[PDB]
Design an enzyme around this catalytic site. Structure first.
Site, PDB file in Angstrom:
ATOM      1  CB  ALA A  46       1.405 -14.509   3.104  1.00 10.12           C
ATOM      2  CG  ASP A  47       0.468  -9.974  -1.146  1.00  9.32           C
ATOM      3  OD1 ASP A  47       1.404  -9.414  -1.758  1.00  9.32           O
ATOM      4  OD2 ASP A  47      -0.170  -9.448  -0.216  1.00  9.32           O
ATOM      5  CB  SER A  48       4.647 -12.617  -4.107  1.00  9.66           C
ATOM      6  OG  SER A  48       3.620 -11.814  -4.732  1.00  9.66           O
TER       7      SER A  48
END
Lengths: 97, 33, 394, 85, 49, 49
Positions: free
Chosen positions: D38-40
């Site tokens: 997950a990335d922002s």
């Protein structure tokens, strides 16, 4: 509940019965029912558990639904082992609390 | 352990874990209702 | 000390005694199928020490008649000694022959004409292996049955809730039950001088068609390795023939799975030895029977061993608890109820393959002779045991 | 006022797996989001998928500090519990 | 009463696990009860007497 | 006792209470109209009734 009596149900709002069933009084019902179901599970030849519930319909007790077999004692037989097992299971909740 | 050996109904029945005697109270009125 | 009898017995007495002990144990424990130990020790307050003549179960047993599990075991023994090696098709045909003959069938009732013609093997047969033997005889392939059966007997479906599985009817039968672990003593007797992996391949070929999962295979491997250990050992050396040595041996090189070795360890450090009981009414109400029953309940679920690990553990418990007393051992094994026929049969088999023949009491041989089996069946099984001490092909 | 936290947890994990594309055994109740890939910009789309599935509204101040699956489950359960009042 | 005290005292861990499950879940089925109890190592009774 | 004489009423048939399978069949038809989750183990929910 049938007159000025009462004292068992617990969600109606009126003086006798509080609204959200205080949590300290829910921990106790959980302990009661856990002890009773544990004892009914480790006793050989007892009936079998179908469902275990805490404060159903807001009543201030537990409830365990036992299903049995009608082809073993055909609505008439009662040995001694069964009676002693039932006594133990009914005192289990008090002892656990 | 084997604490269940030293259970004695004369001197009081008690378990191992430390006495969860936590509690609280509002007034009598805000507890009746 | 322990049992003495003769010195170190020969090789023919070992085999014929193993088969004889199996037969007597099975026919003795036959009527106590499917009940708990307290019910049994209150039905037979004077001890389970002779054959019963009045059985009233749903599939009633007559005097001295054995079950289907011993039929399976004896078919395994003869088909091994006949083809001179464990062959799947040969013993499958032998098993289904011994299962089908003498029986009968009944038709059923349903509007559209449903053909559920039930086969009623004249002898009592476990449900799972009954399904297996009728699928093999219905024409279906003899090797792909396990995956079809293990999901047909999935009548358990969801078993929503419904906790207490006391009802044996609810026990997890299938490719991890005692179905294949019961008929694995004569095999482990045949290969007693063959080496470990040969034993393993033999027992694997012995169960490919009903019990392929690792658990039942490991239970059968355990019982076979124990039988081979006794076949190689001798009842005179106070150094080699001891419970501790056999237990350690079996755990090191025979045990593979996790709960198998767990149960075996738990039996190992908790094992004690019963004294010579001559009064059964005082034994059943004594501290030693209580200790034994506590251990037995720990090695099982409510006193009914249906998994392979449970089966092996309880068998070796009953066998090692009375090291030096095979008759006392088979009586104790039958007195525990549950799956009494299978357990008592395997305990008698191992006791025979270790101590020999001079221990079977006279009255049991007599009752075997006087039952419906008669001299025919008695001499049949003693000859099938005789034709077992000289087979080593391939 | 009483929520079956078990059901909420199973549904959270299934939604997360379907959103990210990893399989349900890898999603553990203590797995952070940064390692699951997950990335922002996607710890947000996951929040939107959660709200869309459960039909609730998240409390934003606490939603700023969501970094493990168990916090997601507990936020959702504390929201579902406080629905009547 | 003595048998009940003994049976609960030797199964302390399983008792606490089941209590917590009931406290947070509300209702349980029999199969979940069996699972929770067996994953915590219960010790059955030998007989009902 | 007048009608129980021969010819008038000489046959009585007793219809008993159902069993597990009978109750399962009974509720499998009370579902043909209503909406019901299909995969219901009708036998087990009938054993408890």
């Amino acid at each position: 509940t049938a007159g000025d009596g009462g004292g068992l149900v617990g969600g109606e709002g009126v003086e006798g019965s509080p609204d959200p069933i205080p949590p300290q009084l829910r921990r106790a019902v959980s302990v009661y029912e856990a002890g009773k179901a544990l004892l009914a599970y480790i006793t050989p030849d007892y009936e079998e558990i179908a469902r275990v519930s805490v404060c159903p319909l807001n009543v201030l007790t537990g409830f365990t639904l036992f299903v049995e077999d009608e082809d073993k004692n055909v609505n008439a037989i009662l040995t001694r082992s069964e009676l002693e097992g039932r006594m133990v299971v009914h005192l289990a909740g008090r002892c656990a609390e | 352990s084997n604490w269940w050996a030293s259970i004695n109904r004369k001197t009081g029945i008690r378990g191992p874990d430390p006495a969860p005697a936590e509690e609280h109270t509002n007034g009598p009125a805000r507890d009746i209702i | 000390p322990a049992w003495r009898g003769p010195g170190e017995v020969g090789d023919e007495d070992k085999a014929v005694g193993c088969l004889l002990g199996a037969a007597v144990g099975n026919v003795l424990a036959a009527p106590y199928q499917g009940d708990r130990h307290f019910e049994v020790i209150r039905l037979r307050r004077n001890g389970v020490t002779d054959f019963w003549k009045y059985d009233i179960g749903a599939q009633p047993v007559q005097y001295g008649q054995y079950t289907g599990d011993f039929a399976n075991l004896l078919a395994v023994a003869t088909s091994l000694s006949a083809s001179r090696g464990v062959e799947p098709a040969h013993l499958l045909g032998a098993l289904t022959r011994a299962y089908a003959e003498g029986g009968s069938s009944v038709e059923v009732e349903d509007a559209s004409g449903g053909s559920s013609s039930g086969f009623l093997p004249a002898r009592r047969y476990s449900p799972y292996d009954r399904l297996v033997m009728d699928a093999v005889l219905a024409g279906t392939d003899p090797l792909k049955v396990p995956e079809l059966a293990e999901r047909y007997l999935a009548e358990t479906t969801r078993r929503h809730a419904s906790s207490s599985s006391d009802r044996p009817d609810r026990e997890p039968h299938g490719p991890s039950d005692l179905g294949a672990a019961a008929r694995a003593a004569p095999i482990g007797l045949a290969y007693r001088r063959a080496g470990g992996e040969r034993l393993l391949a033999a027992v694997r070929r012995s169960l490919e068609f009903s019990h392929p999962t690792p658990l039942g295979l490991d239970a059968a491997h355990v019982v076979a390795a124990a039988a081979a250990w006794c076949g190689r050992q001798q009842p005179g050396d106070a150094v080699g023939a001891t419970p501790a040595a056999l237990l350690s041996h079996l755990l090191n090189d025979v045990a593979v799975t996790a709960e198998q070795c767990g149960k075996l360890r738990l039996l190992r450090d908790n094992l004690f030895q019963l004294d010579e009981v001559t009064d059964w009414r005082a034994f059943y109400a004594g501290p030693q029977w209580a200790r034994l029953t506590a251990l037995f309940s720990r090695l099982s679920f409510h006193g009914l061993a249906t998994a392979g690990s449970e089966f092996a553990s309880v068998v070796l418990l009953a066998l090692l608890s009375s090291w030096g007393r095979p008759e006392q051992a088979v009586i104790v094994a039958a007195s525990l109820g549950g799956h009494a026929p299978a357990t008592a049969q395997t305990v008698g088999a191992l006791a025979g393959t270790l101590y020999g023949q001079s221990w079977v009491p006279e009255r049991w041989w007599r009752g075997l002779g006087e039952g419906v089996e008669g001299e025919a069946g008695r001499e049949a099984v003693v000859q099938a045991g005789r034709a077992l001490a000289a087979v080593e092909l391939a | 006022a009483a929520v079956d936290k078990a059901k909420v947890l199973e549904d959270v994990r299934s939604i997360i797996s379907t959103q990210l594309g990893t399989e349900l055994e890898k999603v553990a109740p203590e797995a952070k989001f940064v390692d699951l890939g997950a990335d922002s910009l996607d710890t947000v789309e996951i929040m939107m998928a959660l709200e869309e599935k459960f039909e609730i509204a998240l409390e934003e101040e606490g939603a700023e500090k969501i970094a493990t699956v168990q916090d997601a489950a507990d936020m959702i359960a504390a929201q579902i519990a406080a629905k009547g009042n | 009463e003595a048998k009940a005290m003994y049976g609960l005292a030797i199964n302390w861990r399983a008792l606490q696990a089941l209590t917590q499950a009931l406290l947070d879940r509300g209702t349980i089925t029999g199969k979940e009860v069996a699972h929770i109890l067996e994953s915590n190592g219960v010790i059955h009774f030998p007989d009902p007497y | 006792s007048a009608l129980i004489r021969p010819g008038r009423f000489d046959r009585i048939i007793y219809m008993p209470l159902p069993d597990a399978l009978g109750r399962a069949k009974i509720m499998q038809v009370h579902a043909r109209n209503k909406a019901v989750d299909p995969n219901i183990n009708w036998y087990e929910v009938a054993r408890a009734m």
